[PDB]
Amino acid sequence: AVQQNKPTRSKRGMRRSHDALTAVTSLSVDKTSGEKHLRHHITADGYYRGRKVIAK
Amino acid sequence: MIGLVGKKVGMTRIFTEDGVSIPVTVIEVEANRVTQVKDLANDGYRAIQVTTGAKKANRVTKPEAGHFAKAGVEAGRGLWEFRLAEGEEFTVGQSISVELFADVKKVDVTGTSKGKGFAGTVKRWNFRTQDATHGNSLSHRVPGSIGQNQTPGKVFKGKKMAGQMGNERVTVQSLDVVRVDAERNLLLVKGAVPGATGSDLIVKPAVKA
């Protein structure tokens, strides 16, 4: 099954009406190191909720 | 008359003196509490609205809490209405126990049927299956043809097709009330009722004779 007419550029546009990404708004900052990090995730230097977890 | 809101506990059985096993659904019916009356003057129809159970205060909202507060009953897991019937009369804050049913004899029991997800034609509509064998190519559970030819030249609305099945409102009519025990918040009705254990049920006295 293939199209009988070439869809319109407008239609392409409408089909993509919903693929905008959503930026996060959910970063937080570790109280004890001040690195940004997703909520509920650890930081790059391995801090989580202030205590230094991990250590690598 | 009015009906109560309960919870589906599970099924078991009551063995009877003369060796019958009655299969029963065990429905919890905590006191229903009237959260609002409605009348002609104010609403254009008479009915009680009721709550039951309890709700984590943190998860009660400002609006909800307002509305509850007014009737002076504590929050409950939800609200449900029952159409009053010329004669029936209640007052805000009134408490209704399962003993409402200490007779009736049969009840209609509404719940939300277990959710099967995206059902295909066979399961959802009892569509009878094509050959497993004898040449059939990729077409065993598939739904067959869905129309005629140019005439319609379309598919008719209401066509039995595959889609969500389950997880919708279902009433089951005229089940024998088996037991009513308010001290224990029990309603035993004979037979299985809609919805998985745990979910809400609406028991109204059966409408059919």
């Binding site: - | 506990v9 599970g10 078991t12 059985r13 009551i14 063995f15 009877t16 003196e17 003369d18 060796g19 096993s21 065990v26 919890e28 224990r184 029990l186 035993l188 254990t197």
Partner: protein
């Protein structure tokens, strides 16, 4: 479920004697013979026990006039007046479904005795 336990065990028998698959039991069952209620005996080998509280049940197999008759009792039905152990059987297996494929002589199971 805590309620349902309450409902179920207040309906359970507190005297079901002991028996295990292999044992030969005689179940005495109430029945209406025409115009008469009356106890009636069913005796055979316990080939299976379904252990579930009020819903507990057992399948008793017996060879009546030439072929098998299995009947699954519901241990707590009033219909079941009494259960009795005529002979303690020695097997190892919870479900004795294989005795079906055995006739007369192969069917026999060692006595437990102990």
């Amino acid at each position: 479920s805590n309620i349902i336990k309450q409902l179920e065990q207040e309906q359970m028998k507190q005297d079901v004697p002991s028996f295990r698959p292999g044992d030969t039991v005689e179940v005495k069952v109430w029945v209406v013979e025409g115009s008469k209620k009356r106890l009636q005996a069913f005796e055979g080998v316990v080939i299976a026990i379904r252990n579930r509280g009020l819903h507990s049940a057992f399948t008793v197999r017996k060879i009546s006039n030439g072929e098998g008759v299995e009947r699954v009792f519901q241990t707590h039905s009033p219909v079941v007046d009494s259960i009795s152990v005529k002979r303690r059987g020695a097997v190892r297996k919870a479900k004795l479904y294989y005795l079906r494929e055995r006739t007369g002589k192969a069917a026999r199971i060692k006595e437990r005795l102990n």
